[model samples]
Target chain A: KQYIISEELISEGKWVKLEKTTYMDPTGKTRTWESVKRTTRKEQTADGVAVIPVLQRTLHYECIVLVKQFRPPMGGYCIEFPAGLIDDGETPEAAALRELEEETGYKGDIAECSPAVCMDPGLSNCTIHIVTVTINGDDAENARPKPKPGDGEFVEVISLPKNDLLQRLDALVAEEHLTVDARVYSYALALKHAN
Target chain B: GKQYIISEELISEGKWVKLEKTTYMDPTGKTRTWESVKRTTRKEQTADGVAVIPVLQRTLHYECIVLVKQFRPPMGGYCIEFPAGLIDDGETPEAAALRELEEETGYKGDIAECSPAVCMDPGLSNCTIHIVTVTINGDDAENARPKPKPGDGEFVEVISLPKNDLLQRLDALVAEEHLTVDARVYSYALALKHAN
Candidate 1:
């Protein structure tokens, strides 16, 4: 069986790390891969989470919560779902609820939680848990979300109609000339594709 | 207002990954710096790679999806994911999906839908990918015991999952085997359930 022989570190950052991996291929040949890994990851603990907060606004109008915030890496603002890193000793569900409150100003009840899921597998070993949270729009907190974002973090809380999400997101990108996170975009794609 | 990059300074360069310190003007005309990672191998005007969603149609009502299980060094464990690969220079995304799926799962399928560029982890990396859907006929003789021909450095295990009640099935597999499912796959499964 093809197996990894060694992984040599290249550089380390506060949040990201680089490594070179050498492995024996199935053909008995040795090969290497340049990989980036996260440094703050903790074993036996959930690493991150993304919240899909659905708001029951009216009799038939349901909305999905989203946020637009500036991302340093993208060198611009990005539209994304409410998410955060799971702090040490915190459950993904708790992190999702807490992050939703801070980032979007909405408190949510966990409707469902998924197993830890991976992203950017080739470049980095990054994973997050996807949580579906339900927000009762009738609640006073849901009526007008007053966010308490972290220091140096500026985010705009927004929601789009559930059935009209894809259309709204597409129009918002052009109207605001902003960027969208792939996770959020792909989730919308799946929703409409299945529809 | 849209944001624009003021400048970029390469702080760390690796064989594959590079780190850059970017200075940009915010909407309020405030200047700030942020560090982002880059892949040296990326080509301009195209996606960083492509991931194929391979769907298998059995009978009229029966269907399954193809996925690959491999030890992902970044995650430091085995992960279940859609077959994917970096598109070689000048290669079409559809072609890349076809080649990657065949090599990883030994199955060839036809492209059904392909999406525009989508960003993953935009706050950390500028990597973008195209999601391509491929439909496979399970009754085809070519797919019977499809033999994967992974290239060098590729060690993968292929698995087919039923389309019905995929969220529960995917969760059960993860709970039993301690495997990590790709976010895209999990999201797709959840969306499928909602539509049903």
Candidate 2:
């Protein structure tokens, strides 16, 4: 490379430059792109479980519906089991217990639906946390939505019966809510495995 | 005329390109000059931690605007991101994050919590920033909207995507753009790491 030296602020925040570069393309041309970089840290409290507590209520006969909401990216909300970010200093079991109470108004404890990270490398670095909560008539009648923390807020809320979940599943393929897919597929397999 | 070519083979080789000066070759074989800045090797840290380089970064937040808007030219189309500015003069990253966050988002909430780390691309740039998540209740967010000023309307707005919803929406934008350029995406990852 024919050479010279110069310096500029590729990125300057208090601490990080997300990314910056100088290189040649396939055609022997030079280019550069820079980004501000950041580093973050978080603590996981739950162990051996990551779950989305789904709320199901008997509508009529044997039909049951699960509570869900219109998530913007899904082109409106589709059915999803209730989920949460496991709080720091809490185990998977404990976090599930709390999240069940927080996301939906379920007050029952669940010993099942262990937490797990979504297994998809090369896309994003995300922990796929899941937890199952007891959903019975008492569970339904006692269920109530949790209030947002003084530090946080929520956008919208809704519910969907089990009958429509499969149909909605067909519609939401490859949507941003891939974890929603993860939750449903796991349910079928978990049931088969349990049986 | 005296001439020589310098070539050498080395492991972990990184070539830094320099603009020297910009000269466009015309049809007549004549070169025209343009003003530009070139690249230079700023820092190098060996495998052994004998030498250390401290990179620069910031964790900024803005309550100035909301919702996804399209980017013009370079990236193209709408994306979700907080407004940010470089840490200039003598300013702390926390200060920078607060200033930029408000400047961009137009919403002011307390800097609830944060963690420190290095930049993802450590090889190219000398930077290490903290990604801070500022949590605000709906009422507090409403109270923090900036007093209107000239040219403020074009940059900020209030777009409240629920935590779960925002997460999903971000995934779609990533797919559509073939990229994720916003800091929030990276910030979320770090937050999850801390949360877990």
Candidate 3:
């Protein structure tokens, strides 16, 4: 199905189009609402866009890998799982492994794939597929992630202990280290296996 | 502090989202105009949203999560997701969670807990969702299963599963039903199982 763009207001790195949507409410009333559509970079032929939520278990699930970097949109350093746009024709599993390797230098296999799901249905029409990547344990010594310096990317890899994920996040933010992404924070809540 | 000004001109409207240009200023004296979608119950105003993750019985079995299957126009396919909805004005997030649960699956529940409002996608829109924990009402188990009635046109099936076997259920849902599951809900499903 094609959406007829009402107008093109602005053109940036990703084109954003404006549209007026009319839908029936629960009470059977039809109404129109204004919304925005951001063009996705994935190949149309590709299945869908994917966002990898890494559950990188190193040292026997003792810690998970997280990345700290500057996000232009948020205009600050944000702590989040290693994620990015999927290259054309790349599978979600491949993208997850590739992103993990590039962002954290951790080579891992796709442990599991979550269904491609919408991050925010009320916001943009963006959906992401997440994969749990298990880092290679055999090459324990050689597998230490080596992030490249001065590569136009400023990413610091932090290993978070599974036991104190929430406390660690708080300690980092309290120390003026970084702001947390809601998704990352949600992961911490789930990891809090303790009641 | 954040301020929002809805513009006069419209961009593109689809089945779910309405795209328009908006002007806003952040707390740090930054001002910029950006396009955003305003999703609502009717055409009234931007709707406050809520998501409920229901754990059956008092045992906190953390087993048996409630999920709904329906077509998401944006995704262009059916999606497996927890019972969620947009909160109408004057309704509390807790109220919205219980109402949406019943509307989607006839199950009556009480809010056990709630999460602070979290922005699902801050860059795209100002929409926020309050995640709430709900306990199923013992008297309403009859309506708790996949018994579709009338409400959101998206949901096709409602399935409940033991927490221990969520991943297996997801694999089966995809292979057999061909429905995509949302990542946040999917992640939490794994988190709940692992936490157990």
Leading candidate by DockQ = 1
Q: Is candidate 1 or candidate 3 better by TM-score?
A: 1
Residue A153 deviation, candidate 3, in Å? 5.7
lDDT rank order: 1, 3, 2
**Candidate 3 chain A, which ten residues in sequence have the lowest lDDT sum?**
A1-10
Query: Which model scores highest in TM-score?
Result: 1
> How well does each candidate superpose onto the true structure, as a TM-score?
0.91, 0.32, 0.69
Please, what's the RMSD in Å of model 2? 22.8
Candidate 3 lDDT, B81-111, residue by residue in tens: 7788877777888988888887887777777
Ranking by DockQ: 1, 3, 2
Relative to the real complex, the DockQ score for model 1 comes to 0.57
Say which prediction, candidate 1 or candidate 3, comes out ahead on lDDT: 1
| Per-residue lDDT of candidate 2, residues A1-195 (tens digit) | 211122234333232222333433334455443322222225542212333444445663211123343222122223444455555676776766665555555555563442233211111123334444545533544555553422222323334333344334444444543223223432322222121
Which residues of candidate 3, in runs, are more than 4 Å off?
A1-14, A20-37, A41-61, A68-79, A122-124, A136-144, A148-158, A166-182, A192-195, B1-47, B58-62, B137-156, B193-196
**Worst 10 contiguous positions by lDDT, candidate 1 chain A:** A38-47
Q: How much is the lDDT of residue A173 in candidate 1?
A: 76
Better of 2 and 3 by lDDT: 3
